[PDB]
Assembly symmetry: C3
Homo-oligomer: 205 residues x 3
Amino acid sequence: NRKLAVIGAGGHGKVVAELAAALGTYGEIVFLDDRTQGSVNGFPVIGTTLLLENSLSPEQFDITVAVGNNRIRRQITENAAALGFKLPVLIHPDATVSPSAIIGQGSVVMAKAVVQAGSVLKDGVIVNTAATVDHDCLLDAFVHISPGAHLSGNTRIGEESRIGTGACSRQQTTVGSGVTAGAGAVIVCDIPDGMTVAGNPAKPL
Amino acid sequence: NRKLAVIGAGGHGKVVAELAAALGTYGEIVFLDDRTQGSVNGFPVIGTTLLLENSLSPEQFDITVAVGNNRIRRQITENAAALGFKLPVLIHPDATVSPSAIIGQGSVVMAKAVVQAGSVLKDGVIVNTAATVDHDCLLDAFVHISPGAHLSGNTRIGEESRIGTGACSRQQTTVGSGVTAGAGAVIVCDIPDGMTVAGNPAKPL
Amino acid sequence: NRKLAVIGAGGHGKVVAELAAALGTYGEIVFLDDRTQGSVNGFPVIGTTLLLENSLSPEQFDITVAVGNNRIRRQITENAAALGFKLPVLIHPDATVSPSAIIGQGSVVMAKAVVQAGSVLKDGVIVNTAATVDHDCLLDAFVHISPGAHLSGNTRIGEESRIGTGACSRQQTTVGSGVTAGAGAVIVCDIPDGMTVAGNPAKPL
């Protein structure tokens, strides 16, 4: 489509809108947001999220959901998909993505991020600024790999998990679903579903 | 100006001189240094720092202060500014800097570094090799973000603070002025002025 | 040479083969491997490692040894060199390598990696995804700097040492030979030969 609607005009949204602008492929980039009006960082906020169900045509707008919170991103993305909107994979020109990587709709790969050979990312993943996902990783739906986090080869990350800024994993580690790993967490073993961990090595909080 | 004088021909200076050379915009790049003579890494050392006040014309030379120590960088930069020299912001071709970032004179952004949307860097900041400054950060004057350090969104770093190699911050953290955070420090709360911290999480030393 | 044989078709091998493909300089890229047959990631496995001594001509094939294990990489690389094969330094287009860096045969520098001014890398080094080696470092033979690890200026790393994913060093630190530093290790002092360390700060295990 000629236009992109970025849902969420917070800080993450600003970065995503600049990423899209850098691609040079959209005729117009706009925000939907429920808390701010006017324009943000030079992009217009054309309305609230009610426009998605009520106004925007999937024949005119692509959608990206720029919400950091994984549960909310999931809810909005699934609603957009259900309404028939395209959810482009947005990859910054300064990211490096392997030609053998597979990346699901609605995912965003930020400046300086790397996704290596054989990795599989499901829907709505964020690989944030300078984060790396090495070969043969599996990142399930709505996972957030925060800025500067580094996953070793063969790391699996379960659905909706958040891996904090500057965190890392040892090779062949498995993180379950709904896991929170704090900034700087050093994941050296498998982490069960629903756990919050932090530290070096990462331990339950 | 056609020429650049890099003050400081140590290791940091070598990297800064190569950064400038990569820009392909200067007719000549030279060093001022007080400890070495001849040439360093193929760039001539044309004299000591006494040339700044006594010899160099601001109509012919731009200045960059390639001194890692934040206090000394401050002293020399302020002296250069007072003598009317231009202090270009030097951004490596392989850095990514947001078009909405604001960066003060004399700052240096190294290869693979990223500065994201809405960030404000004051004078004489170093964002070193592969360091990232995410959206809406504020880095005050003569801050050094060391190689591979990653600041989350909305991180504030006070004047002259040094954030060590591989360190990181959680979102919305505030580091005061004159703070030293050691290599690998994981900054998970606000850090008062003048403190030295290290560890995961970062604690006072 | 017109052709490249990548020895090792595991995950590391897949990344190395894609790196070579990105260079656009080889007429053909193939694998030797002892555990897999057919093709891997779209590159043919033309035989086992017995082809090196018995079949491949050094007048037709360049060799790279895509084995993560430093001792095995050393053994195979030294054998290839002894049989007269060229062992190109392979640098990903998205890596940044200083024009004043020196890098020994058989070394590999991955996407987003940086090697800064005055650094010296001996034979068979791996600088993995987004790892950085700052100015004036010395990395001895068959060292592996894992993804996202960051070495400060003037870091020396002894022969065959493995520096884990997301690890970092303080400036002017010396790591001995045969050292293992775990993922996330924060190297703040010198590490004697043969030691295994981990933690923040890195301590013996």
